[PDB]
């Protein structure tokens, strides 16, 4: 039994070993309690503002839309401490850990952004932090690994399975199943077993809340659409949540199309996978015909979660939100375009969202539309990847 519905329609649930159910229950109760507690809310707001630097700018991108009837704003989560949106909810989850008397943090990471966010929150708040990361990811994300270690976190390479994010997810739950009395599992996306999709949403919802107030102030009306990339779903739901009841506002989520949906080398399970049950939830999955879980492929490391948050699958099902894909090459163009036209280097993840907005604009250039793209991260981390591609293409 729980306080809240673990499902969004048919999607979600609590598919963890029985041993972990008391952990999930405790977390749910503490969250429900925290949300009613003005002290908790005040401390969270204090960290968000004074440590992470909220509120974030909403930037109007005039150059990129010139000659069309598109107005485009970027929500600047790239300016957040840590350089991505991941920082928002780790601060809330660390406060919850403290609320519950936990003194240790477990986190998974793929690209390393969530690991870095977990590490910085843990350092600030005096929690001992261990991060699981697939050995292949450790190998290719040396800079992030070093950042985590500088901040005092233990980074544990995971060599089992495919040695990537899903494997790190497994390892985190295995650890938690034996350490939950003292450790909190700081899951890094709006996915996994209830209550994580709900908590991550509520601890990211300031993105959309701020966006709403900022767009009303600047434009005198709500956006025609808000657009966000979808790895596991946290930045997207963070942007969407405050607009769900504003049914005139389009909610568009962008999954990575990789080398092309038709190649099967992508990370777009919501639209092109198959519903499965894994990592604590019933959700669309990348999976073999045999039901073995597969990796998500994308040029962008952070869009590697091989499933998707259950709330997204639900919002899709009912037609409240629409989900699309953007390919590697589309994302790369959008990356280059923002650099040159706005002097902003976007994360390759969020470059997917930007790419779809540019498509909406270019396809129908005389359509009057007010769009917000969630710029969930900065792209400093991506310049080596971009360099190497451009070099191979003889663009440089």
């Amino acid at each position: 039994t729980t306080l809240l519905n673990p499902y969004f329609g048919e999607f979600g649930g609590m598919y963890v070993p029985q041993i972990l159910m008391p952990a999930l229950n405790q977390l749910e109760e503490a969250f429900v309690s925290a949300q009613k507690d003005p002290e908790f809310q005040a401390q969270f707001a204090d960290l968000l503002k004074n440590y992470a630097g909220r509120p974030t700018a909403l930037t109007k991108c005039q150059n990129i839309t010139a000659g069309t009837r598109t107005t485009l704003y970027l929500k600047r989560e790239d300016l957040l401490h840590g350089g991505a949106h991941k920082t928002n909810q780790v601060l809330g989850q660390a406060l919850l850990a403290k609320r519950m008397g936990k003194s240790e943090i477990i986190a998974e990471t793929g690209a390393g952004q969530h690991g870095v966010a977990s590490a910085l929150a843990s350092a600030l708040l005096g929690l001992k932090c261990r991060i699981y990361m697939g050995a292949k990811d450790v190998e290719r994300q040396s800079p992030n690994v070093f950042r985590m270690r500088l901040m005092g976190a233990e980074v544990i390479p995971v060599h089992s399975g495919s040695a990537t994010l899903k494997d790190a997810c497994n390892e985190a739950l295995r650890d938690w199943s034996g350490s939950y009395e003292t450790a909190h599992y700081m899951l890094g996306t709006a996915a996994g077993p209830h209550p994580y999709p709900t908590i991550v949403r509520e601890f990211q919802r300031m993105i959309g809340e701020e966006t709403k107030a900022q767009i009303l102030d600047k434009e005198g009306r709500l956006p025609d659409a808000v657009i966000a990339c979808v790895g596991g779903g946290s930045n997207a739901i963070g942007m969407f949540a405050d607009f769900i009841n504003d049914t005139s506002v389009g909610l568009i989520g962008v999954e990575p199309g990789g080398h092309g949906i038709e190649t099967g080398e992508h990370g777009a399970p919501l639209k092109h996978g198959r519903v499965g049950i894994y990592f604590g939830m019933k959700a669309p999955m990348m999976q073999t015909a045999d039901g073995q879980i597969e990796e998500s492929y994308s040029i962008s490391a952070g869009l590697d979660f091989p499933s998707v948050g259950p709330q997204h699958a639900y919002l899709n099902s009912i037609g409240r939100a629409d989900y699309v894909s953007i390919t590697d090459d589309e994302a790369l163009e959008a990356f280059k375009t923002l650099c040159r036209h706005e002097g902003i280097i976007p994360a390759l993840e969020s470059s997917h969202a930007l790419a779809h907005a540019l498509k909406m604009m270019r396809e129908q250039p005389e359509k009057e539309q007010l769009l917000v793209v969630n710029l969930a991260g900065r792209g400093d981390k991506d310049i080596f990847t971009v360099h190497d591609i451009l070099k191979a293409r003889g663009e440089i």
Binding site: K166, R174, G178, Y278, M285
Partner: protein
């Protein structure tokens, strides 16, 4: 499930606990696995728990993680596992065969279809490791429709409501979990489970098998002495496989002596 009822009745009559080994199907190959399983039975296994190789076995420690990887390396697929199961049942009419599954493999081709195939090959029970009692309804329904016992976990920190639920809904046996954490012989349970065993009996639960961390004869005896119907051992068995990959003969020899000793310990 009726194989379990018959086993437990016969073991009760002989004043004995059940000794139940776990292996991963197809580890380290199909043929070798079949020989391994026949050896376990010949050496005195009372029932089997058999893992279907899965990409993400998140209730398993490294020993069994490695078993899954070895089976994958041999190219073992769920279809091949069903064929193995049919042959195992064809060879051994009465031994209860329980599967250790993860939810995705059960859900993959349809939950009903999964259990129907289980019935077709002669499986007796299914434990789905990542499905808690809270989520169990569609699995337990499909199981029972196909004459399959749904196996429920009774964690060492069960409250009374969980005990009553497991007692009502379970069949075959009740899995009495030794400790928190994941499978592995390198970690022994700490908590005495006598009280949980008593409460399960009060509620007419399926007989309890203790599992997790069981690697020694004394632990088998201890399970029986505490009132459980028997004990399951996985990692300890799989380690013998891992240890002896380079010597199939020595492997079977060591499996035989280990299983023989563990079964001997089940005598009250």
């Amino acid at each position: 499930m009726e194989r379990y009822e018959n086993l437990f009745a016969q073991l009760n009559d002989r004043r004995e606990g059940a000794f139940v080994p776990f292996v991963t199907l197809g580890d380290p190959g199909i043929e070798q696995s079949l020989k391994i399983i026949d050896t376990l039975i010949d050496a005195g296994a009372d029932a089997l728990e058999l893992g279907v190789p899965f990409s993400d076995p998140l209730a398993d420690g490294p020993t069994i993680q490695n078993a899954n990887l070895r089976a994958f390396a041999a190219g073992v697929t769920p279809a091949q596992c069903f064929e193995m199961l049919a042959l195992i049942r064809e060879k051994h009419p009465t031994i209860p065969i329980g599967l250790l599954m993860y939810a995705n493999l059960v859900f993959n081709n349809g939950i009903d279809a999964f259990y129907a195939r289980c019935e077709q090959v002669g499986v007796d029970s299914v434990l789905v490791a990542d499905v808690p009692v809270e989520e169990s309804a569609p699995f337990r329904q499909a199981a029972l429709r196909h004459n399959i016992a749904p196996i429920f976990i009774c964690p060492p920190n069960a409250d009374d409501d969980l005990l009553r639920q497991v007692a009502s809904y379970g069949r075959g046996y009740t899995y009495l979990l030794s400790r928190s954490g994941v499978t592995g012989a390198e970690n022994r349970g700490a908590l005495p489970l006598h009280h949980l065993i008593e409460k399960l009996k009060e509620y007419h639960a399926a007989p309890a098998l203790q599992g997790f961390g069981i690697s020694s004869p004394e632990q088998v005896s201890a399970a029986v002495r505490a009132g459980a119907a028997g004990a399951i051992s996985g990692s300890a068995i799989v380690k013998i496989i891992e240890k002896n990959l380079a010597s199939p003969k020595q492997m079977l020899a060591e499996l035989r002596s280990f299983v023989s000793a563990m079964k001997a310990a089940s005598r009250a």
